[PDB]
Amino acid sequence: KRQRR
Amino acid sequence: SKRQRR
Amino acid sequence: GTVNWSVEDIVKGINSNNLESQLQATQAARKLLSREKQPPIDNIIRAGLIPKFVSFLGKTDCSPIQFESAWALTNIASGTSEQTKAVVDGGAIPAFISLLASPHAHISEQAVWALGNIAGDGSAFRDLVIKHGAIDPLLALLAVPDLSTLACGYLRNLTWTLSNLCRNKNPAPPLDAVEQILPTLVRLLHHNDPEVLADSCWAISYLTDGPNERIEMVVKKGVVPQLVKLLGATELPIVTPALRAIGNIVTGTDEQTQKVIDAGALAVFPSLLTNPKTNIQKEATWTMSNITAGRQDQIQQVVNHGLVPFLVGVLSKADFKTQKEAAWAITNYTSGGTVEQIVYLVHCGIIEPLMNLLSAKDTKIIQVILDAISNIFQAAEKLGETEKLSIMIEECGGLDKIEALQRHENESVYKASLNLIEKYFS
């Protein structure tokens, strides 16, 4: 899954 | 973020 | 003349009720506040001068004292939050917004500058500048057929102040303010000045750092191709915010990520992943990690573009925080990839540099790597080739480190460790 900044 | 002029 | 006055003399002239005397004292304050080493901002504040400067902003018949006080207040607002607050507390925000309509370009520019410092302090003052109505007169200054006819420094200051209206979170800027600003931002993003381009990219990077709806507002304006073009610029101050924006966008939906790929971004990553500036390598590897978190057809584009050897390279040698983003890129790839894509990863040489990073003291990168190793073993299960992989892990010293890690502080590392040993190193 995506990792936000 | 902030800028001092001269 | 006005060089090196004491604060006391400045107060004496400003309090004189002689407009020329006040003009000279205000210019003397402006020169004090313009020096680089320790400008006496607190001394000027403590002398009570801000209300006087603010009222000088309204003196339409004496444009020099409008300029000098605008410049003096600009430089107070350039300081700490408390110093910017003193400027706001004196009523400067509506007075500066009024000055945006000045017929004197150098005075409207100074008001643009001051509002950018105020808005740049943080979310609350940013939103306060917006509530006082700054956006319409700011954008009107840019309502010309060709931006090239505007003076260069003037356009740079407007771009920067607009980027501060796009900056900061908790909360992000108001949705309607962003929608109002974006078409001018898109236009500045296609201008040919490198500083305007850098600050436009910074503004877009702020707007894309948030939930998918924020990203969508930007992506829907069609700017991704221009961002990808700027990703290939020779100027590092352009590449850096362009890459942040591109990285921010690929934290969104698979569809928003696909627009970055459709625009040709992946062809730039051989350079970015070997870039001499370590921050570029890190940001680029983080971006890659979010692309390998995508669909199998997006992983396949990473493969087609030859980017898996570049991930092996960063995993083998890079500064540690880049290597950790590379580890994440690998675990995401092995989490979502097909068996064939995972086999291809092993053939590119991922195993040995993955094992070598199990010597890292960072507990989370060890977890990330153990997960990747389990994901690769799961693909080898589907092929009956677990044994060939165990040998590979053992010949490169990896089993020694997976066996060491089962005596590790973190319980999830110990568990993942022994599970690997039991099932594949019996």
Residue numbers in the entry:
A (entry chain A): 919 to 923
B (entry chain C): 918 to 923
C (entry chain B): 72 to 497
What's in the article?
The crystal structure of MmImpα/NIT-2 NLS presented two fragments of NIT-2 NLS peptide bound to major and minor sites, which is similar to several monopartite NLS-MmImpα structures. Electron density is also present for six peptide residues (918SKRQRR923) at the minor NLS-binding site, bound at the positions P0′-P5′ of the MmImpα. K919, R920 and R923 residues (positions P1′, P2′ and P5′) present charged interactions between their side-chains and Impα side-chain residues. Interestingly, despite the structural differences between NcImpα and MmImpα structures, the NIT-2 NLS peptide binds to NLS-binding sites with the exact same residues at each position of MmImpα and NcImpα. The comparison of the NIT-2-NLS binding at the major site of MmImpα and NcImpα reveals that the contacts are very conserved, with the equivalent residues of both Impα proteins making contacts with NIT-2 NLS peptides. While NIT-2 NLS interacts with N283 and G281 at position P3′ and with E354 N319 and R315 at position P4′ from MmImpα, no important interaction is observed between the NIT-2 NLS side-chain at positions P3′ and P4′ and NcImpα. Thus, the structural and calorimetric study with MmImpα complexed to NIT-2 NLS revealed that this peptide binds as classical monopartite NLS (consensus sequence: KK/RX(K/R)4) to a mammalian Impα, similar to a fungal Impα51.
Impα is an adaptor protein that links the cargo protein to a carrier protein (importin-β; Impβ) that, through transient interactions between Impβ and NPC proteins, translocates the Impα/Impβ/cargo protein complex to the cell nucleus. Consensus sequences for these two cNLS were proposed and correspond to K(K/R)X(K/R) and KRX10–12K(K/R)X(K/R) (where X corresponds to any residue, but positively charged amino acids are preferred at this position and hydrophobic ones are also acceptable), respectively. These sequences bind to Impα through hydrophobic and polar contacts with two binding sites, known as major and minor binding sites. Similar to other Impα structures, the major binding site is located at armadillo (ARM) repeats 2–4, and the minor site is located at ARM repeats 6–8.
